[PDB]
Design a protein around this ligand. Structure first.
Ligand SMILES: CC(C)CCC[C@@H](C)[C@H]1CC[C@H]2[C@@H]3CC=C4C[C@@H](O)CC[C@]4(C)[C@H]3CC[C@]12C
Ligand SMILES: CC(C)CCC[C@@H](C)[C@H]1CC[C@H]2[C@@H]3CC=C4C[C@@H](O)CC[C@]4(C)[C@H]3CC[C@]12C
Ligand SMILES: CC(C)CCC[C@@H](C)[C@H]1CC[C@H]2[C@@H]3CC=C4C[C@@H](O)CC[C@]4(C)[C@H]3CC[C@]12C
Ligand SMILES: CCCCC#Cc1nc(N)c2nc(-c3cccs3)n([C@@H]3OC[C@@H](O)[C@H]3O)c2n1
Ligand SMILES: CCCCCCCC/C=C\CCCCCCCC(=O)OC[C@H](O)CO
Ligand SMILES: CCCCCCCC/C=C\CCCCCCCC(=O)OC[C@H](O)CO
Ligand SMILES: CCCCCCCC/C=C\CCCCCCCC(=O)OC[C@H](O)CO
Ligand SMILES: CCCCCCCC/C=C\CCCCCCCC(=O)O
Ligand SMILES: CCCCCCCC/C=C\CCCCCCCC(=O)O
Ligand SMILES: CCCCCCCC/C=C\CCCCCCCC(=O)O
Ligand SMILES: CCCCCCCC/C=C\CCCCCCCC(=O)O
Ligand SMILES: CCCCCCCC/C=C\CCCCCCCC(=O)O
Ligand SMILES: CCCCCCCC/C=C\CCCCCCCC(=O)O
Ligand SMILES: CCCCCCCC/C=C\CCCCCCCC(=O)O
Ligand SMILES: CCCCCCCC/C=C\CCCCCCCC(=O)O
Ligand SMILES: CCCCCCCC/C=C\CCCCCCCC(=O)O
Ligand SMILES: CCCCCCCC/C=C\CCCCCCCC(=O)O
Ligand SMILES: CCCCCCCC/C=C\CCCCCCCC(=O)O
Ligand SMILES: CCCCCCCC/C=C\CCCCCCCC(=O)O
Ligand SMILES: CCCCCCCC/C=C\CCCCCCCC(=O)O
Ligand SMILES: CCCCCCCC/C=C\CCCCCCCC(=O)O
Ligand SMILES: CCCCCCCC/C=C\CCCCCCCC(=O)O
Length: 393
């Protein structure tokens, strides 16, 4: 069948993908620019991500279309249009790796997060990572290429000029770079680091929610113990434990009542302890019952406001992990095909239709991030609606 027929489907699909990558990711950047609530360090790596996805539809996809033709070109010039998408894919990994780290710092040390993780530093890291993306993505241009052994039978068959080659990806980029350097070192290892960072985010979250439920139990159980105690020493024991678990939880209009609610609580425990150390066992049990009023007015509201925040931090970590995981679902096929081309020379090269299919799959990854934000993030969804209603409609 004529090559232009199959090539037309691939090109139409690529262009259709390009439009969707530019539209959806320009919509993300427009939301982060307008909504002040969306302006945080975590969302500055999202804009770096969206920028990389914008450049895929504007440059990487046009470049991919160009190299599918095998047009005659200067080898190093063809080497650039073959390696530019590696820069964009490398930038996406750095951002994906920074979001995972930023979400870990947020849940592992929320108190020193505002000073440690600032916007000006996020900008310096984004700039640093973008430069390194060009260094890593264009390494073949520094010498690790196949321009020293061009297929001159292929170049002559296509009427190429002196110093030109038939611009094909696997003919100018060595496969040991794509497998050992790009896939294993620069794509796989970083994705494994993310997997481990997300394992520690969720581990730190399950632990903290449980430890807050342990204090909530240690208080009420010690209150029940006092309501059934018999002497002043028992009461003094159940209060010594409660004071430890109270100050332990202490560690805005809401933070003012949160600090007042614990002053009352810890103070009321001091009230009962003095009586327990004075031999008054009845007056101590009565003073401890006033904690039941502080509990149903301050403590139970704090426990639930802290439980909700930990849940909101887990929801966001999951949303971030769905973005890095879908990056693997889209890029692993094309990487796994390169491994078969590289590791098994006795295997038939994957057919051209599977290459196209794997190539367009890697490009659909630049369309899906705006959908995860709109689906899994309430603030992004609302801001997308505002832009669509006010400007696009
Ligand atoms: C700011 C952005 C939009 C500029 C984009 C410039 C791009 C399209 C330019 C920059 C370098 C250019 C390449 C450099 C060298 C060659 C070798 C020549 O034998 C074939 C064209 C080719 C392969 C060029 C194609 C177009 C190219 C990739
Ligand atoms: C969710 C993702 C990671 C699963 C996708 C795995 C895909 C890319 C794997 C599964 C089976 C693989 C194929 C199995 C057999 C062959 C025949 C061989 O002569 C060329 C490679 C080729 C054609 C493989 C290419 C890659 C392949 C299609
Ligand atoms: C941990 C996961 C997500 C990373 C991906 C695993 C990759 C590296 C694995 C999965 C399947 C593997 C391939 C399975 C079969 C073959 C055929 C063999 O003759 C050469 C090695 C080769 C080509 C393997 C290379 C490595 C491979 C591509
Ligand atoms: C098969 C169609 C003919 C032209 C081609 C090709 C081709 N063959 C590959 N073996 C290949 N491997 C990659 C990868 C880059 C980063 C990770 S995997 N690419 C790039 O990904 C989209 C393609 O258009 C190209 O830009 C590849 N292209
Ligand atoms: C390539 C296009 C990428 C365009 C990137 C422009 C980003 C503008 C943006 O969203 O800025 C975020 C905002 O400034 C956060 O404070
Ligand atoms: C993930 C979602 C990808 C987008 C949806 C379908 C891709 C349709 C295939 C696009 C690539 C072209 C493959 C093809 O049909 O062309 C092979 C041709 O026959 C060889 O000569
Ligand atoms: C295709 C079914 C319709 C749904 C569309 C989505 C699925 C597209 C997936 C693969 C298309 C490529 C199929 C494989 C084409 C192989 C061509 C072939 O058999 O080789 C030519 C042979 O040399 C001469 O007979
Ligand atoms: C959308 C329109 C794209 C349709 C044309 C793209 C395929 C043509 C490729 C070719 O000219 O060989
Ligand atoms: C990804 C696909 C979603 C497409 C985005 C549609 C909204 C366009 C935003 C705009 O043009 O202002
Ligand atoms: C390349 C040209 C397209 C990039 C446009 C992205 C900017 C969109 C919103 C920024 C605020
Ligand atoms: C090719 C190189 C393209 C580089 C991409 C540049 C745009 C991408 C991300 C910009 C992120 C903006 C975040 C601003 C943080 C600084 C701040 O406002 O405090
Ligand atoms: C708006 C920013 C995006 C600009 C992209 C411009 C659209 C170009 C799309 C595909 C270009 C592919 C050209 C193929 C080159 C080979 C042609 C030939 O061999 O004669
Ligand atoms: C922005 C520009 C994106 C569109 C152009 C993309 C890649 C450059 C196309 C180069 C095609 C060269 C074909 C002519 C030839 O060398 O014979
Ligand atoms: C967008 C601007 C330019 C993209 C179109 C590139 C087409 C170059 C093909 C040259 C040729 O026909 O030989
Ligand atoms: C805004 C920054 C502008 C710089 C953009 C980079 C443009 C040049 C990119 C790659 C240079 C490769 C072209 C060299 C021709 C190939 C030489 C050869 O094969 O003999
Ligand atoms: C590091 C961030 C800025 C990088 C922007 C991209 C500029 C181009 C980078 C490398 C170009 C190397 C290829 C130069 C062509 C040389 C051709 C030859 O030697 O025959
Ligand atoms: C900064 C790191 C590298 C910049 C220099 C790379 C230029 C490569 C020239 C291409 C060639 O080998 O002829
Ligand atoms: C072959 C050299 C290319 C440079 C490597 C590119 C891939 C980056 C992989 C790991 C970088 C590690 C530093 C980034 C932060 C993650 C560290 C961590 O696990 O906490
Ligand atoms: C290679 C494996 C890719 C790992 C996926 C990245 C982030 C999701 C981790 C899930 C916990
Ligand atoms: C950051 C760590 C990155 C990679 C190491 C993989 C193991 C980390 C997850 C296990 C630790 C845990 O779940 O508590
Ligand atoms: C290795 C990574 C492969 C698959 C991980 C996919 C993560 C889940 C993405 C879809 C969730 C909606
Ligand atoms: C995550 C980590 C994934 C593991 C990566 C697998 C590494 C190497 C597997 C490929 C080995 C193939 C060697 C066979 C070559 C031959 O004998 O022809």
């Amino acid at each position: 069948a004529p090559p232009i027929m199959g090539s037309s489907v691939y090109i139409t699909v690529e262009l259709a993908i390009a439009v969707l990558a530019i539209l959806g990711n320009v919509l993300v950047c427009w939301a982060v620019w307008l909504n002040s609530n969306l302006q945080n360090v975590t969302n500055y790596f999202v804009v770096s991500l969206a920028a990389a996805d914008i450049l895929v539809g504007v440059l990487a996809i046009p470049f991919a279309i160009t190299i599918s033709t095998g047009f005659c070109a200067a080898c190093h010039g063809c080497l650039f249009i073959a390696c530019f998408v590696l820069v964009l894919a490398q930038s996406s990994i750095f951002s994906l790796l920074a979001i995972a780290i930023d979400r870990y710092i947020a849940i592992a040390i929320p108190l020193r997060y505002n000073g440690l993780v600032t916007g000006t530093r996020a900008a310096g890291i984004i700039a640093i990572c973008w430069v390194l993306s060009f260094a890593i993505g264009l390494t073949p241009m520094l010498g690790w290429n196949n321009c020293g052994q061009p297929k001159e039978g292929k170049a002559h068959s296509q009427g190429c000029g002196e110093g030109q080659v038939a611009c094909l990806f696997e003919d100018v980029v060595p496969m040991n770079y794509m497998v050992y350097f790009n896939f294993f070192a620069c794509v796989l290892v970083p994705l494994l680091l993310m997997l481990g960072v997300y394992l520690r985010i969720f581990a730190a979250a399950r632990r903290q929610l449980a430890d807050l439920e342990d204090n909530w139990e240690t208080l009420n159980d010690n209150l029940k113990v006092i309501e059934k105690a018999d002497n002043a020493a028992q009461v003094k024991d159940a209060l010594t434990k409660m004071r430890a678990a109270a100050l332990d939880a202490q560690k805005s209009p809401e933070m003012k009542d949160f600090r007042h609610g614990f002053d009352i609580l810890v103070g009321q425990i001091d009230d009962a302890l003095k009586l327990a150390n004075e031999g008054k066992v009845k007056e101590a049990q009565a003073a401890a019952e006033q904690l039941k009023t502080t509990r149903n007015a301050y403590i139970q509201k704090y426990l639930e406001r802290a439980r909700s925040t930990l849940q909101k931090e887990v929801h966001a970590a999951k949303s971030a992990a769905i973005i890095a995981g879908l990056f693997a679902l889209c890029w692993l096929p094309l990487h796994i095909i390169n491994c078969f081309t590289f590791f098994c020379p006795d295997c038939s090269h994957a057919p051209l239709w599977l290459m196209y299919l794997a190539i367009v799959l890697s490009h659909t990854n630049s369309v899906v991030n705006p959908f995860i934000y709109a689906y899994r993030i309430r603030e992004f969804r609302q801001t997308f609606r505002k832009i669509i209603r006010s400007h696009v409609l």
